[PDB]
Design a protein around this ligand. Sequence first.
Ligand code: AR6
Ligand code: AR6
Ligand code: AR6
Ligand code: AR6
Ligand code: AR6
Ligand code: AR6
Ligand code: KDH
Ligand code: KDH
Ligand code: KDH
Ligand code: ZN
Ligand code: ZN
Ligand code: ZN
Ligand code: ZN
Ligand code: ZN
Ligand code: ZN
Lengths: 279, 279, 279, 282, 282, 282
Amino acid sequence: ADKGKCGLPEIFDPPEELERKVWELARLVWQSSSVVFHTGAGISTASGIPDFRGPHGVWTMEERGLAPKFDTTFESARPTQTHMALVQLERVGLLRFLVSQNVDGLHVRSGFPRDKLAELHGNMFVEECAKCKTQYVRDTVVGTMGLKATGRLCTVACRGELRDTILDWEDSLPDRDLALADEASRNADLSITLGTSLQIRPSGNLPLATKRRGGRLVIVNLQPTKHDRHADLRIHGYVDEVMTRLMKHLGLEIPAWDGPRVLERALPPLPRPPTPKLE
Amino acid sequence: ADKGKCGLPEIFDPPEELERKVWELARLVWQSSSVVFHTGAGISTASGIPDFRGPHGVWTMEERGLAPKFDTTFESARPTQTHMALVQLERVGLLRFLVSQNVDGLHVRSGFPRDKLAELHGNMFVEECAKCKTQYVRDTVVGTMGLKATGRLCTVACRGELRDTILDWEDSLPDRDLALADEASRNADLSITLGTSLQIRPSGNLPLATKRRGGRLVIVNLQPTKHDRHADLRIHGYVDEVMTRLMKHLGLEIPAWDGPRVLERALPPLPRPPTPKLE
Amino acid sequence: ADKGKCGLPEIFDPPEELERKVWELARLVWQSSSVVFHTGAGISTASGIPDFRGPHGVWTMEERGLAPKFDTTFESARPTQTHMALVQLERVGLLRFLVSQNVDGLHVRSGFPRDKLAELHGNMFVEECAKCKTQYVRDTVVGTMGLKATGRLCTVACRGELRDTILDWEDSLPDRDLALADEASRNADLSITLGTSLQIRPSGNLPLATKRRGGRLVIVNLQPTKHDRHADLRIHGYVDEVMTRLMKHLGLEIPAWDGPRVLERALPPLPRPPTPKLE
Amino acid sequence: PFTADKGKCGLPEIFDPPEELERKVWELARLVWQSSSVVFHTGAGISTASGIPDFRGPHGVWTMEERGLAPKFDTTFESARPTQTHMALVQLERVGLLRFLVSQNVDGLHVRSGFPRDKLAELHGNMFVEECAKCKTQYVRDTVVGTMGLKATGRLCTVACRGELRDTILDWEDSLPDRDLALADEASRNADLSITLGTSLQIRPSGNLPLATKRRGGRLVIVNLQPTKHDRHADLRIHGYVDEVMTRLMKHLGLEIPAWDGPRVLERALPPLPRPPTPKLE
Amino acid sequence: PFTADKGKCGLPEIFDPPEELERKVWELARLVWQSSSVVFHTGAGISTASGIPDFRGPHGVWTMEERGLAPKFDTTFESARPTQTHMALVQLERVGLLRFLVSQNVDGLHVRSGFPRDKLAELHGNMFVEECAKCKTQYVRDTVVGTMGLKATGRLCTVACRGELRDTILDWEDSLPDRDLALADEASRNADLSITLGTSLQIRPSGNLPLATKRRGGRLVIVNLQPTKHDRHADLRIHGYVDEVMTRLMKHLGLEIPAWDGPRVLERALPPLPRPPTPKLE
Amino acid sequence: PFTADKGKCGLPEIFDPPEELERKVWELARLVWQSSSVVFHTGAGISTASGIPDFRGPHGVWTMEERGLAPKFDTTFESARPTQTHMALVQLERVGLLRFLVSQNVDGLHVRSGFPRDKLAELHGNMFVEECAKCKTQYVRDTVVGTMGLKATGRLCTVACRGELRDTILDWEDSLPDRDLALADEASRNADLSITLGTSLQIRPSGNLPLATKRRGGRLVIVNLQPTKHDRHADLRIHGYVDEVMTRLMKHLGLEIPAWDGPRVLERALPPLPRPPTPKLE
Ligand SMILES: Nc1ncnc2c1ncn2[C@@H]1O[C@H](COP(=O)(O)OP(=O)(O)OC[C@H]2O[C@H](O)[C@H](O)[C@@H]2O)[C@@H](O)[C@H]1O
Ligand SMILES: Nc1ncnc2c1ncn2[C@@H]1O[C@H](COP(=O)(O)OP(=O)(O)OC[C@H]2O[C@H](O)[C@H](O)[C@@H]2O)[C@@H](O)[C@H]1O
Ligand SMILES: Nc1ncnc2c1ncn2[C@@H]1O[C@H](COP(=O)(O)OP(=O)(O)OC[C@H]2O[C@H](O)[C@H](O)[C@@H]2O)[C@@H](O)[C@H]1O
Ligand SMILES: Nc1ncnc2c1ncn2[C@@H]1O[C@H](COP(=O)(O)OP(=O)(O)OC[C@H]2O[C@H](O)[C@H](O)[C@@H]2O)[C@@H](O)[C@H]1O
Ligand SMILES: Nc1ncnc2c1ncn2[C@@H]1O[C@H](COP(=O)(O)OP(=O)(O)OC[C@H]2O[C@H](O)[C@H](O)[C@@H]2O)[C@@H](O)[C@H]1O
Ligand SMILES: Nc1ncnc2c1ncn2[C@@H]1O[C@H](COP(=O)(O)OP(=O)(O)OC[C@H]2O[C@H](O)[C@H](O)[C@@H]2O)[C@@H](O)[C@H]1O
Ligand SMILES: O=C(O[C@@H]1Cc2c(O)cc(O)cc2O[C@@H]1c1cc(O)c(O)c(O)c1)c1cc(O)c(O)c(O)c1
Ligand SMILES: O=C(O[C@@H]1Cc2c(O)cc(O)cc2O[C@@H]1c1cc(O)c(O)c(O)c1)c1cc(O)c(O)c(O)c1
Ligand SMILES: O=C(O[C@@H]1Cc2c(O)cc(O)cc2O[C@@H]1c1cc(O)c(O)c(O)c1)c1cc(O)c(O)c(O)c1
Ligand SMILES: [Zn+2]
Ligand SMILES: [Zn+2]
Ligand SMILES: [Zn+2]
Ligand SMILES: [Zn+2]
Ligand SMILES: [Zn+2]
Ligand SMILES: [Zn+2]
């Protein structure tokens, strides 16, 4: 398979400059009416799950003929500070939609509302019914990858064949998830990309669609990305450090993780701090 | 009055078998899309309120020419672990409707949402307006039984006659409550009966209507019931022990009781654990 | 400007009588289906913000050629026990609408829901867009009074002129806020006025509109008011003392203040205690 | 054993009318406020609202035995939830309004509610506790041990002993554990108020301890639905449900009754918490 | 009484501009961080944002008296809610950043906020507290006792005494309670930082105690809207509202200001809580 | 320095199959329940799930060095969040199931999780802590000090000293701090159970301390993905992720793993909290 540029050196913005940029980001969150986050494997490295195209990334290790390292199971992985921050942004109405490429299930398990998430590449923990299209979010990883049969049957009242939701190398993106994602991206005045290299054809382009009709793009990545030149702001730092500085400037706590929890529909919005004066 | 079979010996399932059955129940809660609970006086014995047809039950004591025992007032009675568990099941979306024969007011006082409860036999604590059909949930028991005048007047803007809601021996069941209850029972793939003997004509039949079109019935009672042969699972144990084991297997806390609280309309659903893999 | 009667002596109801009246008020809250609060500067004196027409009030001090005293900034002012009590009344459904003359921003900052508040005289902390009528709730006081330009521009996607929302001496009342307020007052069976003298022409009359078609008026003020003769109950005491006694009789806690928080839309109602028996 | 003296059983119940009841609970609040040293004495009446029948009440174990009937249990000892009264006493210890607690119940619900073991004397023992014959070390288990009358359970001591574990349930001829009796006698002796909840006070050492408070000026309060052995020695008798009494009392004191996290053992009392200031009295 | 020395009243207020204000609150944070022993001294200025007028401020009791006017109260002593400043000091004690607290206020709001009585010296007394003439025992009441100048209230001691209860409000000629002064003098003497909030420091023993910190190297900080007696002895003077200053300070320290559960007395300090690690300084 | 003995690096990992894994975590729960004195020994394996690479694991610093590669950090030491394992150990101290904690990590996450410093021995030091050469006083900072090998940071002591502040990071030839080693040796000596999480036990004083538990009857448990120096001395070896093991263990114990409020220092352990009653064993 065509696996794109792997193992680029990383960039570390100096602290003075890094604080300047997170204040810029905060201003843009404040200035905007419609914010989408797009997330990749990078938001999960700090919970012990390796990325694909970083120094110790799955593709990168393969090329040096090495195995990537897991410091946790998918089951025992805890959502990062960045995961819980996105939960809080959605709950106070500063985050309209969230689009993720990750198959690791941590967005859902963090208690992010499923009706505001597009899982572009699917979910280790989710089976679909080949007959009635019903989704089961399970407590362990299903067992298969590539939309093959798990050997469990639908229970609605059906007995249809349940399959995995992990695309293989030629599978089309789920249409509902891709549709919602394209809508959210097109109709945004701010897209922010966290821990994605933006190299995958459909998924990595959607942030650019925010730039059509005047909208700002922000990119938060340790490595260069495919679209660095299209950004209004590029932040080279650990997303956790970036996201904790950001919540602090927004006057928002990062909520505790109750443990693995599914929320299907978003709850009505909670109160948030008032906006600073700007310009 | 025709008062049915009273004082049957009780059954105690051995522990090994009891744990096997509560795992069966949990599987059925997991497998189902539409769960109704039906509750009788048995869920209230552990808060000091005696049942009707048990060893020390009101009807049973009468026959041996004895008085039944109250270890609490209706006012000072605290909802049981089983009451608070049903509150939590509704709040995480594992319980669609609840149908109760009890007049003791503990469902409402536990903070169960009234728009998801049918009080088939009425409520010590509730007056209705004979004119505009408005319901007042009071902090003490009204004073009368049999739909007679309390001597308090409606306050909407009416001055109509407020009466008790406790049926006497020939009164028809409230039509709205009976209607909602029959709907919830018919359109369920799982009914579970807790602390009811199922001997009363309209009320005790509704669980059977779940069995039409493929639906499962579960019965949790210390004594035999009228419908033991129709069940898919029979659990002979204390509902509190059963319900605490069940919540544990579902990965759900039993909430604290804030004290006496009326919730008219159900709130949108809270997150719940993901489902195990089954078969 | 015509500034009305200033500096009247205050009245202090004796304790026996004061407790009798707060029990009367509580009965009326219990008896009613539709309660509006109207609030003036008096609910803010206990957080260090002086009133207009009291002994040490802005107008009153001017006449004796004195400056009124601020013991806090608008920014550092904390909502009073009366503010947080009104938050709790709205959240348990005992308060339908709230109408305030205060420009101090404490209702909004207490986390009262904006869709249930009419700010009749505007808000130090709020800018409006002269073009698209969009409102920005800021974290500091805007800088101008009298609907003049702040020198900040709209950010929707507009670049329109943002102005203050503080009426000057001839400006018409905001039409949406006045409209909602007149509706809420007309269709109420109980209006309660807290810390207002009711001297301002549109604002001070709205409580009277509750008295049309049988509705009760209650007035809580240390000084005489314009409309004392129209009231069913007059309570001469500190609103904080009155409101804490009231919540106690209603069996309701006064919530902690999380700090400055904007809630745009009201959340669905929380459970409340059941009603006593009355007459 | 069989011929043992089981006392007066099944006496009629008394119900103070609502008026006389509120005035009495207000009077108790006053005695708590006025007192520098409050001991509580509890019996099986604090456990009936959690599904456990008493001994000498209308459906009490002894009372049903005399009529040839069986007491009814509405739960196991394991699934039993501490009452409003149990949780209210945890709080009174946590704000310093309760010096000591002396109970005759073996149901374990005091310990399971999180009451600190160093401020409680379990006069008749505890179904959940086994001792070591050698070590004298106490294990608090998540289930009932199996035996009564201080017999070997089948488990051994795990200090590093391998000594014999035994139940703590006294039999008819068995003396009281000397440590619990001694602390209970001291706490009762130097109390300026004893309040007895759900006990009829017929058992010889246990039922007399509140009288030791009445020597040297101390006040005694008896809350019970039936007459009790010492009704004549009381300064205040309250005929009502201990839950109603304790919920009113706490309300007068301005204290909230704590949630029960589930079965939880606390060996040693934590330092005191803030409590409301005292009303002005006379 | 009438002729008594009431000091300089109604001085003009000073307002540090926003810039100079943030730099000064950052400088205070640094002094807290650097110091192993922080005492606070409070006066009536911490109580004005809760509706209680001061003595020597523009609308202060003495200041209005001199012009022939009356001070205004925006609440009773009973309905008065502790300020952001009161609750912030509770927290600083709970994380170990405050060794002792020395207040001249008689409004009781320190005690009512849950500040532990063993780490606070009530130099001028407390409206809510009566002593026993005989016992010397202190009762903290839910309402103001009635009298000032150490006169009998009409209540008697309830230790088991029947001794005379008296107010603790000092009069003009009355000495300071020796215990509170002694602890305040010790805490001030061995402090390496004293911070004074809302006091003008004119009263002779009370106002001098922060200077005792300045002997043997100690730093003194004065936060006050008006000049104060000792402005010249300070290492840092902050002209702003004590609430704004304390809310900024806590934010710099990474501490949250606690909710007030309502009127609550705590006799003895609880053990310390975790607090954020220190910034690197110079 | 360069030639130093770095031990066996990059050994293969072992994965106990699910069945054998649950039976082993149940067996550990039993050993905790049976034991009166539990010490934990932690190494860099408890920090890998928070983005910090270990030393001798497959991508461990030493292991990558040997292959000519660089270890990867998924966060700074400052933005690093304590793991499920870190927070689970805080709780076990708070309910009295953990007597002492002995760690070889310099990452500071134990202290930052709110683990009380008086029940923990930081054998190899702490990036966030500077000592005073003169005072021997320790400052816990909000950022990493700058240096390793006990060299001057550039800051001075603020006790009132002006002494030299130094890092606490041991170098290759540096002895262990005598106080931490002494407490660790005592706690290990008198423990009836040692449990080692994420250490390969190759460092000479630190790795041997769990063996001191095995003298005079004590049980030793090793939880580690790779073989360790002392695998043969263990009574129980668990090959799995320390998070999975600790989350199962806590569930068996009926304890919840606490939220992390953010970076918070606690000098002295608080008194114990209630914990569930013990299961009946054999
Ligand atoms: N803590 C961190 N902070 C910031 N950036 C980080 C961090 N850790 C890693 N990164 C950066 O995070 C970036 C991760 O980029 P890639 O590894 O390509 O992941 P994707 O989500 O874009 O891959 C998309 C799909 O391709 C796959 O085949 C699967 O199908 C995926 O679903 C790097 O550039 C790191 O520098
Ligand atoms: N803790 C317990 N766990 C399980 N079962 C229990 C428990 N306690 C009691 N039971 C069982 O609980 C069952 C209770 O059954 P019945 O007493 O007939 O009550 P109903 O609600 O069905 O009576 C319906 C109406 O009839 C009346 O006239 C009123 O009008 C009622 O509204 C017994 O079989 C006990 O074994
Ligand atoms: N703690 C207290 N408790 C009760 N009453 C109080 C308290 N404190 C003060 N009061 C009473 O509170 C009353 C305050 O009345 P006014 O001062 O006229 O304020 P408004 O809101 O009615 O003025 C309306 C507009 O007029 C202005 O020009 C602005 O445009 C305002 O928006 C007094 O009668 C006090 O006795
Ligand atoms: N809800 C209630 N509220 C108040 N009182 C109650 C309640 N329920 C019951 N009572 C009263 O509670 C009282 C309980 O009286 P007894 O049953 O003799 O209990 P003991 O603890 O004194 O028995 C001591 C020993 O006797 C044995 O030999 C064992 O060794 C026991 O340990 C009754 O008078 C009820 O009226
Ligand atoms: N919000 C505020 N922020 C800051 N400072 C304030 C504030 N409000 C007022 N102030 C200042 O707070 C200061 C208060 O000064 P004084 O009123 O003399 O109070 P004391 O506590 O020193 O009086 C001591 C004794 O005097 C009597 O005889 C009694 O016995 C008293 O106990 C002023 O300078 C205000 O500028
Ligand atoms: N998630 C995990 N679960 C369980 N074990 C793990 C995990 N991740 C890693 N491990 C294991 O964790 C183990 C860590 O072994 P080492 O890296 O030698 O750490 P130390 O603390 O013993 O090094 C001591 C000193 O050595 C230096 O010189 C410094 O001075 C250090 O302080 C491996 O065996 C992994 O298999
Ligand atoms: O602790 C004693 O009983 C246990 C506690 C208890 C209670 O608190 C309330 C109640 O309604 C019943 C009740 O039965 C319990 C019990 C204990 C046993 O050891 C036992 O064999 C049994 O069948 C049942 C006990 C003590 C005694 O001294 C005694 O003589 C006796 O017969 C029993
Ligand atoms: O404690 C003293 O006053 C009380 C506290 C207080 C305050 O904190 C702020 C304020 O704005 C006013 C204020 O009045 C209070 C007060 C106390 C009385 O005893 C009293 O008779 C009264 O009318 C009112 C006091 C002490 C004094 O030494 C004194 O000389 C005096 O006149 C009064
Ligand atoms: O504390 C030591 O390192 C720090 C802690 C640490 C860790 O916990 C896990 C990890 O994956 C890497 C790691 O690097 C840290 C570090 C410390 C330094 O002082 C330093 O100069 C550096 O580059 C990086 C240390 C101790 C040593 O004894 C030693 O010999 C050494 O080289 C380093
Ligand atoms: Zn299907
Ligand atoms: Zn009607
Ligand atoms: Zn606009
Ligand atoms: Zn032993
Ligand atoms: Zn005395
Ligand atoms: Zn030093």
